[PDB]
Design an enzyme around this catalytic site. Structure first.
Site, PDB file in Angstrom:
ATOM      1  N   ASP A 110       7.040  12.357  24.517  1.00  0.00           N
ATOM      2  CA  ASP A 110       6.319  13.445  23.890  1.00  0.00           C
ATOM      3  C   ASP A 110       7.191  14.677  23.726  1.00  0.00           C
ATOM      4  OD1 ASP A 110       4.449  11.672  25.160  1.00  0.00           O
ATOM      5  OD2 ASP A 110       2.883  13.204  25.252  1.00  0.00           O
TER       6      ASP A 110
ATOM      7  N   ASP B 155       6.672   9.266  20.704  1.00  0.00           N
ATOM      8  CA  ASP B 155       5.272   9.393  21.092  1.00  0.00           C
ATOM      9  C   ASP B 155       4.765  10.693  20.462  1.00  0.00           C
ATOM     10  OD1 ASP B 155       3.483   7.788  23.429  1.00  0.00           O
ATOM     11  OD2 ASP B 155       2.725   9.770  22.927  1.00  0.00           O
ATOM     12  N   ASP B 156       3.684  11.276  20.975  1.00  0.00           N
ATOM     13  CA  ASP B 156       3.142  12.467  20.291  1.00  0.00           C
ATOM     14  C   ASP B 156       4.210  13.516  20.065  1.00  0.00           C
ATOM     15  OD1 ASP B 156       0.417  11.684  19.996  1.00  0.00           O
ATOM     16  OD2 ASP B 156       0.161  11.965  22.194  1.00  0.00           O
TER      17      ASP B 156
ATOM     18  N   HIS C  17       4.265   9.649  17.316  1.00  0.00           N
ATOM     19  CA  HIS C  17       2.844   9.309  17.153  1.00  0.00           C
ATOM     20  C   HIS C  17       2.051  10.443  16.557  1.00  0.00           C
ATOM     21  CE1 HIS C  17       3.137   5.890  20.371  1.00  0.00           C
ATOM     22  NE2 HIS C  17       4.073   5.778  19.424  1.00  0.00           N
TER      23      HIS C  17
ATOM     24  N   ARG D 132      -4.242  13.277  15.133  1.00  0.00           N
ATOM     25  CA  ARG D 132      -5.296  12.676  15.925  1.00  0.00           C
ATOM     26  C   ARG D 132      -6.001  13.686  16.826  1.00  0.00           C
ATOM     27  NH1 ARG D 132      -2.950   7.910  19.676  1.00  0.00           N
ATOM     28  NH2 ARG D 132      -1.142   9.319  19.652  1.00  0.00           N
TER      29      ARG D 132
ATOM     30  N   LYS E 127      -8.054  12.660  20.116  1.00  0.00           N
ATOM     31  CA  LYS E 127      -8.390  11.502  20.942  1.00  0.00           C
ATOM     32  C   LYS E 127      -9.033  11.955  22.220  1.00  0.00           C
ATOM     33  CE  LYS E 127      -3.279  11.245  21.808  1.00  0.00           C
ATOM     34  NZ  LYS E 127      -2.248  10.525  22.523  1.00  0.00           N
TER      35      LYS E 127
HETATM   36  O1  LIG Z   1      -2.900  10.765  25.158  1.00  0.00           O
HETATM   37  C1  LIG Z   1      -2.494  10.168  26.139  1.00  0.00           C
HETATM   38  O2  LIG Z   1      -3.257  10.039  27.224  1.00  0.00           O
HETATM   39  C2  LIG Z   1      -1.128   9.564  26.259  1.00  0.00           C
HETATM   40  O3  LIG Z   1      -0.487   9.693  24.999  1.00  0.00           O
HETATM   41  C3  LIG Z   1      -0.151  10.135  27.284  1.00  0.00           C
HETATM   42  O4  LIG Z   1       0.391  11.394  26.912  1.00  0.00           O
HETATM   43  C4  LIG Z   1       1.681  11.478  27.489  1.00  0.00           C
HETATM   44  O5  LIG Z   1       1.476  12.065  28.768  1.00  0.00           O
HETATM   45  C5  LIG Z   1       2.273  10.097  27.543  1.00  0.00           C
HETATM   46  O6  LIG Z   1       2.825   9.791  26.241  1.00  0.00           O
HETATM   47  C6  LIG Z   1       1.011   9.215  27.678  1.00  0.00           C
HETATM   48  O7  LIG Z   1       0.866   8.892  29.054  1.00  0.00           O
HETATM   49  O1  LIG Z   2       0.088   7.575  21.396  1.00  0.00           O
HETATM   50  C1  LIG Z   2      -0.633   7.117  22.309  1.00  0.00           C
HETATM   51  O2  LIG Z   2      -1.733   7.627  22.577  1.00  0.00           O
HETATM   52  C2  LIG Z   2      -0.220   5.917  23.147  1.00  0.00           C
HETATM   53  O3  LIG Z   2       0.932   5.312  22.535  1.00  0.00           O
HETATM   54  C3  LIG Z   2       1.258   4.068  23.174  1.00  0.00           C
HETATM   55  O4  LIG Z   2       2.349   3.581  22.421  1.00  0.00           O
HETATM   56  C4  LIG Z   2       1.756   4.477  24.584  1.00  0.00           C
HETATM   57  O5  LIG Z   2       2.195   3.257  25.261  1.00  0.00           O
HETATM   58  C5  LIG Z   2       0.651   5.053  25.287  1.00  0.00           C
HETATM   59  O6  LIG Z   2       1.074   5.493  26.635  1.00  0.00           O
HETATM   60  C6  LIG Z   2       0.087   6.372  24.591  1.00  0.00           C
HETATM   61  O7  LIG Z   2       1.103   7.423  24.601  1.00  0.00           O
END
Ligand SMILES: O=C(O)[C@@H](O)[C@@H]1O[C@@H](O)[C@H](O)[C@H]1O
Ligand SMILES: O=C(O)[C@H]1O[C@@H](O)[C@H](O)[C@@H](O)[C@H]1O
Ligand SMILES: *[C@@H]1O[C@H](CO)[C@@H](O)[C@H](O)[C@H]1NC(C)=O
Ligand SMILES: *[C@@H]1O[C@H](CO)[C@@H](O)[C@H](O)[C@H]1NC(C)=O
Ligand SMILES: [Cl-]
Length: 333
Positions: free
Chosen positions: A151, A171-172, A193, A224, A226
């Site tokens: 991230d 990732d994010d 992401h 997103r 989420k």
């Molecule tokens: O949204 C989430 O819970 C995850 O993407 C977490 O955010 C971040 O702490 C790590 O990418 C994953 O553990």
């Molecule tokens: O973007 C996300 O929410 C997810 O992405 C997946 O690839 C990752 O393995 C998760 O830990 C979380 O970070």
């Protein structure tokens, strides 16, 4: 007032001007700076972190009204010595977050290179905190898909602005997990992401977020929101997407979902989302052939969501389950 070692960092009390020289943070050490209120901290070299078994953060700075002048220097996390394709989900230990920034002030023009996993944790704050012109360069983590959970910015804080930054990661780009009055403006996100709020956990509340003027490319999601399906006593309220340009999205252009960690299905009702808008300048999102344009999966959502300035093209239609919220306008169905 010049820091040339981990031990020197402990000696900066009374310095209104600190010079942070380049050096290596050895295994088993952390670099902690607690500068005087209103101090200027100027980086004058790159700081390399030898492979370590410690938990992060490996660098922590905490102060009030700090003016951090990075002069384009680098915090090198040596992430390829740890990356194994599993991130913080399993496999090798990843020191995370790499950096932690707490308190208030203005942080400019430095690079985080190859964080082991999550790069910069932000918060809590004691007044406004601005991060400006920071690069999180985790591009090397794309090789053999070894970087993961890299991230750019994880924010649990009030009164934060992140602007003019660049994130190349897996990732994010940003994950806003808690706090009020957070602005993410004029940033460039690639490889990861996308721009996220959440995942929202029990007891966490995100509000008054502005996501404006950003570019997202070659990412799994565009934007997103989420929330963990099981979260309770939580919320997201007051989010405005304005003038974002997004393309090359593999999974969802927009995913607003209370099913996390699933994208859809039996969404939760304990983390209500309200007042989510795409207004101001056009937010235009282009998704890949196998992607979905927009999905909203609400167990508990409210308000008049004005999505008039959203255009999403490519891929296939998603599904809209907006609960009590009414979504108006846009082009994406
Ligand atoms: O949204 C989430 O819970 C995850 O993407 C977490 O955010 C971040 O702490 C790590 O990418 C994953 O553990
Ligand atoms: O973007 C996300 O929410 C997810 O992405 C997946 O690839 C990752 O393995 C998760 O830990 C979380 O970070
Ligand atoms: C971690 O791996 C163990 C076994 O390797 C497995 O039980 C567990 O579910 C995995 N956890 C994650 C997040 O992968
Ligand atoms: C920080 O945020 C808290 C809660 O949102 C608010 O009470 C306070 O006025 C904010 N302070 C500044 C400087 O923005
Ligand atoms: Cl160690």
């Amino acid at each position: 007032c010049t820091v040339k070692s981990v031990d020197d960092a402990k000696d900066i009390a009374g310095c209104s001007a600190v010079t942070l020289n380049g050096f290596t943070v050895p295994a088993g050490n952390t670099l902690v700076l607690n500068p005087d209120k209103g101090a200027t901290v100027t980086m004058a070299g790159d700081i390399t972190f030898a492979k370590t078994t410690l938990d992060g953060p490996l660098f922590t700075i905490d102060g009030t009204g700090i003016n951090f002048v990075g002069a384009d220097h680098i915090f090198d996390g040596n992430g390829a010595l740890y990356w194994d394709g599993k991130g913080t989900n399993n496999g090798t230990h990843k020191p995370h977050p790499f950096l932690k920034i707490k308190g208030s002030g203005t942080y400019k023009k430095f690079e985080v290179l190859n964080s082991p996993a999550q790069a910069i944790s932000v918060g809590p704050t004691d007044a406004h905190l601005t991060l400006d012109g920071i690069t999180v360069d985790d591009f090397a983590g794309d090789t053999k898909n070894l970087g993961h959970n890299t991230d750019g910015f994880d924010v649990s804080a009030n009164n934060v602005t992140i602007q003019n930054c660049i994130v190349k990661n897996q990732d994010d780009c940003i994950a806003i997990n808690d706090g009020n009055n957070i602005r993410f403006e004029n940033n460039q996100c690639s490889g990861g992401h996308g721009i996220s709020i959440g995942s929202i956990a029990t007891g966490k509340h995100v509000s008054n977020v502005v996501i404006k003027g950003n570019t997202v490319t070659r990412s799994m999601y565009g934007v997103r929101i989420k929330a963990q399906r099981t979260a309770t006593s939580a919320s997201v309220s007051g989010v405005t997407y304005d003038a974002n340009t997004i393309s090359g999205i593999a999974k969802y252009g927009v995913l607003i979902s209370q099913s996390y960690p699933d994208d859809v299905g039996n969404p939760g009702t304990g983390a209500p989302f309200s007042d989510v808008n795409f207004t101001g300048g056009a937010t235009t999102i282009k998704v890949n052939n196998a992607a979905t344009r927009v999905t909203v999966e609400c167990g508990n959502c409210s308000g008049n969501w004005n999505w008039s300035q959203l255009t999403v093209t490519g891929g296939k239609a998603g599904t809209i389950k907006s609960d009590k919220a009414k979504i108006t306008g846009g082009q994406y169905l």
